[PDB]
JSON list of C-alpha atoms in Angstrom, two decimals:
[
{"chain": "A", "resi": 1, "resn": "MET", "atom": "CA", "xyz": [0.00, 0.00, 0.00]},
{"chain": "A", "resi": 2, "resn": "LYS", "atom": "CA", "xyz": [1.16, 3.49, -1.05]},
{"chain": "A", "resi": 3, "resn": "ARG", "atom": "CA", "xyz": [0.28, 7.12, -0.35]},
{"chain": "A", "resi": 4, "resn": "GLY", "atom": "CA", "xyz": [-1.43, 9.09, -3.14]},
{"chain": "A", "resi": 5, "resn": "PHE", "atom": "CA", "xyz": [0.31, 11.98, -4.92]},
{"chain": "A", "resi": 6, "resn": "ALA", "atom": "CA", "xyz": [-1.11, 14.41, -7.54]},
{"chain": "A", "resi": 7, "resn": "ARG", "atom": "CA", "xyz": [1.28, 16.54, -9.67]},
{"chain": "A", "resi": 8, "resn": "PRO", "atom": "CA", "xyz": [0.16, 20.21, -10.01]},
{"chain": "A", "resi": 9, "resn": "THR", "atom": "CA", "xyz": [1.26, 22.76, -12.63]},
{"chain": "A", "resi": 10, "resn": "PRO", "atom": "CA", "xyz": [5.06, 23.20, -12.28]},
{"chain": "A", "resi": 11, "resn": "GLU", "atom": "CA", "xyz": [6.13, 26.24, -10.27]},
{"chain": "A", "resi": 12, "resn": "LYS", "atom": "CA", "xyz": [7.81, 29.15, -12.10]},
{"chain": "A", "resi": 13, "resn": "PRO", "atom": "CA", "xyz": [11.58, 28.61, -12.68]},
{"chain": "A", "resi": 14, "resn": "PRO", "atom": "CA", "xyz": [14.03, 31.54, -12.38]},
{"chain": "A", "resi": 15, "resn": "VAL", "atom": "CA", "xyz": [14.30, 33.39, -15.72]},
{"chain": "A", "resi": 16, "resn": "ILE", "atom": "CA", "xyz": [17.61, 33.37, -17.71]},
{"chain": "A", "resi": 17, "resn": "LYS", "atom": "CA", "xyz": [18.68, 36.68, -19.33]},
{"chain": "A", "resi": 18, "resn": "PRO", "atom": "CA", "xyz": [21.07, 36.57, -22.34]},
{"chain": "A", "resi": 19, "resn": "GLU", "atom": "CA", "xyz": [23.52, 39.43, -23.12]},
{"chain": "A", "resi": 20, "resn": "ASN", "atom": "CA", "xyz": [25.34, 40.89, -26.17]},
{"chain": "A", "resi": 21, "resn": "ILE", "atom": "CA", "xyz": [28.64, 42.73, -25.36]},
{"chain": "A", "resi": 22, "resn": "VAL", "atom": "CA", "xyz": [31.24, 44.24, -27.76]},
{"chain": "A", "resi": 23, "resn": "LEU", "atom": "CA", "xyz": [34.85, 44.63, -26.52]},
{"chain": "A", "resi": 24, "resn": "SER", "atom": "CA", "xyz": [36.74, 47.95, -26.44]},
{"chain": "A", "resi": 25, "resn": "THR", "atom": "CA", "xyz": [39.43, 48.39, -29.12]},
{"chain": "A", "resi": 26, "resn": "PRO", "atom": "CA", "xyz": [43.03, 48.50, -27.76]},
{"chain": "A", "resi": 27, "resn": "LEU", "atom": "CA", "xyz": [45.23, 51.59, -27.68]},
{"chain": "A", "resi": 28, "resn": "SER", "atom": "CA", "xyz": [47.77, 52.46, -30.41]},
{"chain": "A", "resi": 29, "resn": "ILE", "atom": "CA", "xyz": [51.48, 52.95, -29.64]},
{"chain": "A", "resi": 30, "resn": "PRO", "atom": "CA", "xyz": [52.68, 56.59, -29.98]},
{"chain": "A", "resi": 31, "resn": "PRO", "atom": "CA", "xyz": [54.91, 56.78, -33.08]},
{"chain": "A", "resi": 32, "resn": "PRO", "atom": "CA", "xyz": [58.65, 57.55, -32.58]},
{"chain": "A", "resi": 33, "resn": "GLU", "atom": "CA", "xyz": [59.18, 61.35, -32.54]},
{"chain": "A", "resi": 34, "resn": "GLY", "atom": "CA", "xyz": [62.82, 62.47, -32.42]},
{"chain": "A", "resi": 35, "resn": "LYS", "atom": "CA", "xyz": [64.62, 65.50, -30.99]},
{"chain": "A", "resi": 36, "resn": "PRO", "atom": "CA", "xyz": [67.87, 66.93, -32.50]},
{"chain": "A", "resi": 37, "resn": "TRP", "atom": "CA", "xyz": [69.75, 66.51, -29.19]},
{"chain": "A", "resi": 38, "resn": "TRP", "atom": "CA", "xyz": [73.20, 67.07, -30.77]},
{"chain": "A", "resi": 39, "resn": "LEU", "atom": "CA", "xyz": [72.23, 70.56, -31.99]},
{"chain": "A", "resi": 40, "resn": "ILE", "atom": "CA", "xyz": [71.72, 71.94, -28.44]},
{"chain": "A", "resi": 41, "resn": "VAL", "atom": "CA", "xyz": [74.93, 70.17, -27.37]},
{"chain": "A", "resi": 42, "resn": "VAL", "atom": "CA", "xyz": [76.89, 72.16, -29.95]},
{"chain": "A", "resi": 43, "resn": "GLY", "atom": "CA", "xyz": [74.91, 75.22, -28.87]},
{"chain": "A", "resi": 44, "resn": "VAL", "atom": "CA", "xyz": [75.95, 75.14, -25.20]},
{"chain": "A", "resi": 45, "resn": "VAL", "atom": "CA", "xyz": [79.55, 74.60, -26.33]},
{"chain": "A", "resi": 46, "resn": "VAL", "atom": "CA", "xyz": [79.57, 77.63, -28.67]},
{"chain": "A", "resi": 47, "resn": "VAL", "atom": "CA", "xyz": [78.02, 80.00, -26.13]},
{"chain": "A", "resi": 48, "resn": "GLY", "atom": "CA", "xyz": [80.48, 78.63, -23.59]},
{"chain": "A", "resi": 49, "resn": "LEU", "atom": "CA", "xyz": [83.51, 79.03, -25.84]},
{"chain": "A", "resi": 50, "resn": "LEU", "atom": "CA", "xyz": [82.54, 82.71, -26.34]},
{"chain": "B", "resi": 1, "resn": "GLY", "atom": "CA", "xyz": [85.87, 88.65, -36.83]},
{"chain": "B", "resi": 2, "resn": "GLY", "atom": "CA", "xyz": [85.07, 92.17, -35.65]},
{"chain": "B", "resi": 3, "resn": "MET", "atom": "CA", "xyz": [85.79, 91.18, -32.03]},
{"chain": "B", "resi": 4, "resn": "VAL", "atom": "CA", "xyz": [89.21, 89.68, -32.93]},
{"chain": "B", "resi": 5, "resn": "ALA", "atom": "CA", "xyz": [90.13, 92.68, -35.13]},
{"chain": "B", "resi": 6, "resn": "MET", "atom": "CA", "xyz": [89.12, 95.12, -32.39]},
{"chain": "B", "resi": 7, "resn": "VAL", "atom": "CA", "xyz": [91.35, 93.22, -29.94]},
{"chain": "B", "resi": 8, "resn": "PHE", "atom": "CA", "xyz": [94.17, 93.12, -32.54]},
{"chain": "B", "resi": 9, "resn": "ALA", "atom": "CA", "xyz": [93.93, 96.88, -33.17]},
{"chain": "B", "resi": 10, "resn": "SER", "atom": "CA", "xyz": [93.90, 97.55, -29.43]},
{"chain": "B", "resi": 11, "resn": "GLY", "atom": "CA", "xyz": [97.21, 95.66, -29.32]},
{"chain": "B", "resi": 12, "resn": "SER", "atom": "CA", "xyz": [96.55, 92.75, -26.97]},
{"chain": "B", "resi": 13, "resn": "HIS", "atom": "CA", "xyz": [97.95, 90.21, -29.50]},
{"chain": "B", "resi": 14, "resn": "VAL", "atom": "CA", "xyz": [96.73, 87.43, -27.17]},
{"chain": "B", "resi": 15, "resn": "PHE", "atom": "CA", "xyz": [95.39, 85.42, -30.15]},
{"chain": "B", "resi": 16, "resn": "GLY", "atom": "CA", "xyz": [98.86, 84.99, -31.67]},
{"chain": "B", "resi": 17, "resn": "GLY", "atom": "CA", "xyz": [100.00, 81.38, -32.04]},
{"chain": "B", "resi": 18, "resn": "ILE", "atom": "CA", "xyz": [98.02, 78.64, -30.25]},
{"chain": "B", "resi": 19, "resn": "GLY", "atom": "CA", "xyz": [95.92, 81.33, -28.60]},
{"chain": "B", "resi": 20, "resn": "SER", "atom": "CA", "xyz": [94.19, 81.48, -32.01]},
{"chain": "B", "resi": 21, "resn": "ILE", "atom": "CA", "xyz": [92.52, 78.06, -31.39]},
{"chain": "B", "resi": 22, "resn": "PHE", "atom": "CA", "xyz": [89.49, 79.65, -29.66]},
{"chain": "B", "resi": 23, "resn": "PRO", "atom": "CA", "xyz": [88.26, 81.80, -32.58]},
{"chain": "B", "resi": 24, "resn": "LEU", "atom": "CA", "xyz": [89.09, 78.88, -34.89]},
{"chain": "B", "resi": 25, "resn": "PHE", "atom": "CA", "xyz": [87.05, 76.27, -32.98]},
{"chain": "B", "resi": 26, "resn": "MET", "atom": "CA", "xyz": [84.14, 78.72, -32.59]},
{"chain": "B", "resi": 27, "resn": "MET", "atom": "CA", "xyz": [84.01, 79.61, -36.29]},
{"chain": "B", "resi": 28, "resn": "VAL", "atom": "CA", "xyz": [83.80, 75.92, -37.20]},
{"chain": "B", "resi": 29, "resn": "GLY", "atom": "CA", "xyz": [81.02, 75.28, -34.68]},
{"chain": "B", "resi": 30, "resn": "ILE", "atom": "CA", "xyz": [78.87, 78.13, -36.01]},
{"chain": "B", "resi": 31, "resn": "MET", "atom": "CA", "xyz": [79.32, 76.78, -39.55]},
{"chain": "B", "resi": 32, "resn": "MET", "atom": "CA", "xyz": [77.98, 73.33, -38.53]},
{"chain": "B", "resi": 33, "resn": "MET", "atom": "CA", "xyz": [74.77, 74.88, -37.16]},
{"chain": "B", "resi": 34, "resn": "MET", "atom": "CA", "xyz": [73.89, 77.22, -40.02]},
{"chain": "B", "resi": 35, "resn": "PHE", "atom": "CA", "xyz": [74.66, 75.11, -43.09]},
{"chain": "B", "resi": 36, "resn": "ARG", "atom": "CA", "xyz": [73.55, 71.57, -42.21]},
{"chain": "B", "resi": 37, "resn": "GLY", "atom": "CA", "xyz": [71.69, 71.76, -38.89]},
{"chain": "B", "resi": 38, "resn": "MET", "atom": "CA", "xyz": [68.28, 70.05, -38.82]},
{"chain": "B", "resi": 39, "resn": "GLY", "atom": "CA", "xyz": [64.90, 70.73, -40.42]},
{"chain": "B", "resi": 40, "resn": "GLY", "atom": "CA", "xyz": [61.45, 71.56, -39.14]},
{"chain": "B", "resi": 41, "resn": "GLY", "atom": "CA", "xyz": [58.07, 70.05, -39.99]},
{"chain": "B", "resi": 42, "resn": "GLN", "atom": "CA", "xyz": [58.49, 70.74, -43.73]},
{"chain": "B", "resi": 43, "resn": "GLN", "atom": "CA", "xyz": [61.16, 68.03, -44.03]},
{"chain": "B", "resi": 44, "resn": "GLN", "atom": "CA", "xyz": [59.20, 65.10, -42.59]},
{"chain": "B", "resi": 45, "resn": "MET", "atom": "CA", "xyz": [61.88, 62.60, -43.66]},
{"chain": "B", "resi": 46, "resn": "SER", "atom": "CA", "xyz": [64.36, 63.01, -40.85]},
{"chain": "B", "resi": 47, "resn": "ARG", "atom": "CA", "xyz": [66.99, 60.26, -40.64]},
{"chain": "B", "resi": 48, "resn": "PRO", "atom": "CA", "xyz": [65.48, 58.57, -37.56]},
{"chain": "B", "resi": 49, "resn": "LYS", "atom": "CA", "xyz": [62.04, 58.32, -39.16]},
{"chain": "B", "resi": 50, "resn": "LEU", "atom": "CA", "xyz": [63.16, 57.17, -42.61]}
]
């Protein structure tokens, strides 16, 4: 002998929420600017030699 | 040259012999800056970038 059991309408499951995400584009390296260091080196010598 | 001549006319004669090396080295240094030197933004192709 067994106990009776009636299945009701299933209870509401927790809702899943999908998502669409686009990644940020990386940074770009600063290109190689160059100073004429030697020019000022001659400069300080000339004003000094004076 | 005007400075040296003024000193020569005044009679110091300090620039005689090896003393002359100072005007000589200076005159070469000024020449390096004015004739070759380095360019501005109009000459984009500077050695380090090319």
